[PDB]
Specification:
Layout: H1 2-27, H2 46-49, H3 56-64, H4 71-88, H5 94-120
Length: 121
């Protein structure tokens, strides 16, 4: 149907906008702390602590499959990256501190993404 095609074009354009957002958030992690999944070889107990692991590579895979239907779903995954880290790691660690900085810097990016999503529809 033509309606299905138009809905698919909207998803495509949302995917384009979320790719630019993703790139801008990942720039706020210059140490690459959040780039890849926590390795279960290296942290064997991780899934006893963290029930829904997340990282920027995992988000990129979902994005490229057009697997975010709206900005809320994308933000949920980003918040998992931050929130997971701040539970597993203590305050005095480079990991926790990286997460705080990513959260604070990323909030600015996401505030304008939300206006763009609503604006363009």
């Amino acid at each position: 149907s033509m309606e299905q095609v138009a809905m698919e074009l909207r998803l495509t354009e949302l995917t384009r906008l979320l790719r630019s957002v993703l790139d801008q958030l990942q720039d706020k992690d210059p140490a690459r702390i959040f780039a890849q999944p926590v390795s279960l070889k290296e942290v064997p107990d991780y899934l006893d602590h963290i029930k829904h692991p997340m990282d920027f590579a995992t988000m990129r895979k979902r994005l490229e499959a057009q697997g975010y239907k709206n900005l809320h779903e994308f933000e949920e995954d980003f918040d998992l990256i931050i929130d997971n880290c701040m539970k597993y790691n203590a305050r005095d660690t480079v990991f926790y501190r990286a997460a705080v900085r990513l959260r604070d810097q990323g909030g600015v990016v996401l505030r304008q993404a939300r206006r763009e999503v609503d604006s363009i529809g």
